[PDB]
Every structure is written in structure tokens, then in C-alpha cells.
Amino acid sequence: WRLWPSGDRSQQKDKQSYRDLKEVTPEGLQMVKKNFEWVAERVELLLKSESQCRVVVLMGSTSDLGHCEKIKKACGNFGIPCELRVTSAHKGPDETLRIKAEYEGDGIPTVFVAVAGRSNGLGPVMSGNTAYPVISCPPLTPDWGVQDVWSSLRLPSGLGCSTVLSPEGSAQFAAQIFGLSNHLVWSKLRASILNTWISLKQADKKIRECNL
Amino acid sequence: WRLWPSGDRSQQKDKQSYRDLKEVTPEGLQMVKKNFEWVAERVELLLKSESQCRVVVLMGSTSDLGHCEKIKKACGNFGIPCELRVTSAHKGPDETLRIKAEYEGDGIPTVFVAVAGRSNGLGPVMSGNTAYPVISCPPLTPDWGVQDVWSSLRLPSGLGCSTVLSPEGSAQFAAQIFGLSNHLVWSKLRASILNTWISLKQADKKIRECNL
């Protein structure tokens, strides 16, 4: 590669420093060696997380636990810790705000994912009382899902609450948010775009052989 | 009329006490007079309210004030005091519960009417945190009303919150609730069933003449 500290070619730390020498002298090789040492001393820091990430999944009912387990598993795939908590906006709004405060108050950047069946008040109430992002991922089924989804979508002014129907999708969106700050999360998202694209090419190649 | 204290014919206080005398003696007429005095001393109490009534209309936004004015006016027609208050479940749930507590705490029987456009969380949150009845009367328009109504209708278990779409209707329902305890409110409801029925007979009589 070619590596320029501060975008400055004259500070090049890569092997171009050796290619560029008119004549290789022993003083010339010690400069090249120090450039290689400079990179060797920094490269292990590429494995370290610069910023902390957390998803908190708030569920109105323990019957939606299966749906929340899918979000937590999918968060695990991006290396983002994910906590489950049980709270109802309708039946314990005092407790919802106290739980919110626990995660707002310890200095760890947090995305809240609200899982509320039927009339979703948990997304909205959370959204109205935190500066952190809130994602409604309601556990819609085909029975009443067309009716229930609108309680996540049509909100009073002054609420940023977003909607993602897929539980794997809500994890991915939470990852994309943390990817703006965390190169490790970003890189898993980037490699996943590649791997998914590769999978389509391989499935097309297979079905093309069944075209003769 | 015939008036029997405790349903006991032998305690009859009406003119039947005079009709029933085999012979009218002066001692017989003094008994009749005391029966008439007994009724004269109690009849003014029929004008007095035995129980207090109040409707509290909670609105999420001052833009829904017109809709709340219609509820308040219609409550006035049943002689039920009606207060307007502004509170959002989404943006000030702490304040919603403190306002609720003011009306729960002064010993006056109260019906709460929740007016919240779009995703109604105000009905549900109120319903989950008071033993008093809550009526959602959402200000639906034809634009999004088919979508918004389901946030009032499909609630988690443990919530009694009812729905009435008409604002005059929500007042009438509040009146019907107080009519179980208040003979004056009951009587306005009863006379209104008569007057409305009379109006239909009169409109049918009119249109029948335009049938020749």
C-alpha cells in the first residue's frame, strides 16, 4: 500500500520511501527501516474499538421475547452488546423513564429498540423523552399488522422515532448508526454487502446451468 | 300519584289515604293532612343533585381545541362541569400523571376524555394509571382517520379504555355513566330519548304530506 500521515506524501511511511531513493546508502536504509517500524508500532491499534456501542431492546410484554431474541442475536453478529428489558408505557410509564435514565446516564452511546404489539406507545414515549435514537420494531403478524403499524408511523410533531419491521433489519440499522463512529462495526457491514452480492452471483451461476 | 315509602302500601302518603277512609272524621282528615305535609316537606329535595359529576378533557395539542370545545358544550347540556387541560403522553408523561393525580385526589367522581390525534398514547397511558373511566375521542378526519383509529381500539391486556368517535357522543356517554348515580343527569338523557323520538314522528308527518 501507500500510507500518508495527514494526507502528506512527503511523510509517506510505506515502501515507496525505498523505491524513491536515487541511491541506496546505509543512512537511506535506516530511514526506510524507521518508516516500517512506524507502521509496525501502529498497525495493532486497527484491531481496537475507538468508541463503545450498545442496543437496549425494550419490550412491553414477555410474550414478545422470541422477537427480541432475534434482535439480540443479530446484534451479536455486528459485535454490539444488546440488553433486553421489560417495561410498558401504558402500565408503568414512571418505570419506562427510570430505565431510560439508567442507559442515558452512564456515558455509553445507546440505540433503544421499542418492541410493542398492538397500539405502540413505548416507541413514541421513549422517542419524546431521550436525545438518543429510538427504533420501533413492532412484532406484526398478518392478522392485525396492517392496522397496528400506523401507531409506530403517524406521530405528533417533535418526535424522531423511526420504524423498521424486520427484527434482523433493526439490528442492522442500529449497526449502521454505530458504523458512523466504529470502524469495526462499519467493516462488518461493508463485508456483508460484499458477501451477500457474492451469494447472488453464485445462485445465478447455479440456476444458469439448469438453463440447458 | 301513589307514593309508598319503602315500597310499603300501608305507609301510603298520597290521596289514596283519603279515598280509603270508610268514614271521614276530623281525626281522619288530620292523618290525611300529615301525609300531604310529609310529601310537601320532601318534594323540593327532588331538585337537588345527590352526587357530584365532572368530565376532564385532556388534549395532546391546542390545535384540537375546537374538537374539545364541542365536548365541553355538549357536557353543559347535561349540567356536568367540564374542564380542558393540555398534556402529551409522548412529550410530558410525568406531567400527564401529575394532572391525573389532581383529579383523582379531590374526591369528585371524574370521567377523563382523551383527545389525541394520530398515534393516541394519551388514552392508553391514562387508562393504565387510573381506576376512573377513560374515553378516547380522537379528532379523526377522512385523510388518515381509518389508520389513526386503531391506536385507540387495539390495546394491550389490562386496559379498559373505551372509544367514542363523536365528540357530542363522548359527552352523552360520560352523561350515561353519571346517570347511574345522578337522577338529574339521568332525566335529561331520558327526556332527550323522548324529544328525539318526537322529532322523527314530526319529520315523518311533514314528508308524508309531500306524498300526495
Side-chain angles (χ1 to χ4, degrees):
Chain A
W1 55 36
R2 292 186 179 109
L3 250 199
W4 299 350
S6 308
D8 184 357
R9 181 163 149 277
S10 83
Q11 288 175 62
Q12 62 186 4
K13 287 294 181 285
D14 62 275
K15 182 160 121 190
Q16 193 61 42
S17 58
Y18 174 71
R19 301 194 192 101
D20 277 357
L21 295 182
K22 292 215 318 301
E23 176 199 346
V24 185
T25 67
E27 173 191 22
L29 264 181
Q30 284 316 293
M31 184 216 69
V32 168
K33 186 175 171 175
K34 269 184 179 140
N35 289 340
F36 279 62
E37 270 160 1
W38 193 94
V39 180
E41 276 176 47
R42 272 146 193 97
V43 72
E44 252 189 282
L45 310 176
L46 271 55
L47 290 177
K48 259 356 166 231
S49 231
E50 66 258 48
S51 75
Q52 302 197 247
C53 304
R54 176 169 70 183
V55 176
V56 175
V57 178
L58 302 174
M59 77 193 78
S61 176
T62 56
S63 67
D64 296 315
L65 178 62
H67 176 99
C68 300
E69 295 287 8
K70 285 174 190 172
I71 301 173
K72 178 177 183 203
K73 180 180 203 193
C75 281
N77 296 337
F78 295 108
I80 301 164
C82 185
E83 295 186 40
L84 309 178
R85 300 300 297 273
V86 178
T87 183
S88 167
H90 301 324
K91 303 189 288 210
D94 58 315
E95 186 57 3
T96 306
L97 299 179
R98 201 199 53 73
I99 294 166
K100 163 195 76 79
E102 289 186 347
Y103 291 115
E104 280 176 331
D106 67 352
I108 294 174
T110 299
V111 173
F112 293 110
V113 175
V115 174
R118 316 183 160 184
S119 175
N120 174 11
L122 183 58
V125 64
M126 276 300 295
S127 181
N129 294 276
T130 189
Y132 287 163
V134 182
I135 302 165
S136 288
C137 183
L140 304 184
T141 79
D143 283 344
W144 299 105
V146 174
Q147 288 74 47
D148 288 338
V149 73
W150 291 98
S151 66
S152 299
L153 289 173
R154 272 180 56 72
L155 308 186
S157 73
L159 266 57
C161 189
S162 78
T163 311
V164 188
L165 300 190
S166 175
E168 293 77 16
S170 68
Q172 183 169 7
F173 191 67
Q176 282 164 0
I177 290 167
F178 287 123
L180 292 177
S181 313
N182 192 304
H183 81 274
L184 298 174
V185 171
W186 188 85
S187 300
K188 297 199 214 311
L189 291 159
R190 189 57 187 88
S192 181
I193 290 166
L194 172 66
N195 285 329
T196 297
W197 182 86
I198 288 173
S199 279
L200 287 157
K201 296 283 302 185
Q202 297 293 13
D204 181 52
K205 187 204 179 92
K206 209 178 108 178
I207 203 152
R208 230 158 49 212
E209 291 171 6
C210 313
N211 264 355
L212 298 171
Chain B
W1 55 36
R2 292 186 179 109
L3 250 199
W4 299 350
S6 308
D8 184 357
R9 181 163 149 277
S10 83
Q11 288 175 62
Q12 62 186 4
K13 287 294 181 285
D14 62 275
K15 182 160 121 190
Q16 193 61 42
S17 58
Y18 174 71
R19 301 194 192 101
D20 277 357
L21 295 182
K22 292 215 318 301
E23 176 199 346
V24 185
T25 67
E27 173 191 22
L29 264 181
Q30 284 316 293
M31 184 216 69
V32 168
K33 186 175 171 175
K34 269 184 179 140
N35 289 340
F36 279 62
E37 270 160 1
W38 193 94
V39 180
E41 276 176 47
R42 272 146 193 97
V43 72
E44 252 189 282
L45 310 176
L46 271 55
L47 290 177
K48 259 356 166 231
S49 231
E50 66 258 48
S51 75
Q52 302 197 247
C53 304
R54 176 169 70 183
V55 176
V56 175
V57 178
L58 302 174
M59 77 193 78
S61 176
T62 56
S63 67
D64 296 315
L65 178 62
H67 176 99
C68 300
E69 295 287 8
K70 285 174 190 172
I71 301 173
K72 178 177 183 203
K73 180 180 203 193
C75 281
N77 296 337
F78 295 108
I80 301 164
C82 185
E83 295 186 40
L84 309 178
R85 300 300 297 273
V86 178
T87 183
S88 167
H90 301 324
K91 303 189 288 210
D94 58 315
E95 186 57 3
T96 306
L97 299 179
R98 201 199 53 73
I99 294 166
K100 163 195 76 79
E102 289 186 347
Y103 291 115
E104 280 176 331
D106 67 352
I108 294 174
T110 299
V111 173
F112 293 110
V113 175
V115 174
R118 316 183 160 184
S119 175
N120 174 11
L122 183 58
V125 64
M126 276 300 295
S127 181
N129 294 276
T130 189
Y132 287 163
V134 182
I135 302 165
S136 288
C137 183
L140 304 184
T141 79
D143 283 344
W144 299 105
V146 174
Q147 288 74 47
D148 288 338
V149 73
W150 291 98
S151 66
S152 299
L153 289 173
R154 272 180 56 72
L155 308 186
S157 73
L159 266 57
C161 189
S162 78
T163 311
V164 188
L165 300 190
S166 175
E168 293 77 16
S170 68
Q172 183 169 7
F173 191 67
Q176 282 164 0
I177 290 167
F178 287 123
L180 292 177
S181 313
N182 192 304
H183 81 274
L184 298 174
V185 171
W186 188 85
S187 300
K188 297 199 214 311
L189 291 159
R190 189 57 187 88
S192 181
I193 290 166
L194 172 66
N195 285 329
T196 297
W197 182 86
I198 288 173
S199 279
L200 287 157
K201 296 283 302 185
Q202 297 293 13
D204 181 52
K205 187 204 179 92
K206 209 178 108 178
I207 203 152
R208 230 158 49 212
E209 291 171 6
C210 313
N211 264 355
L212 298 171

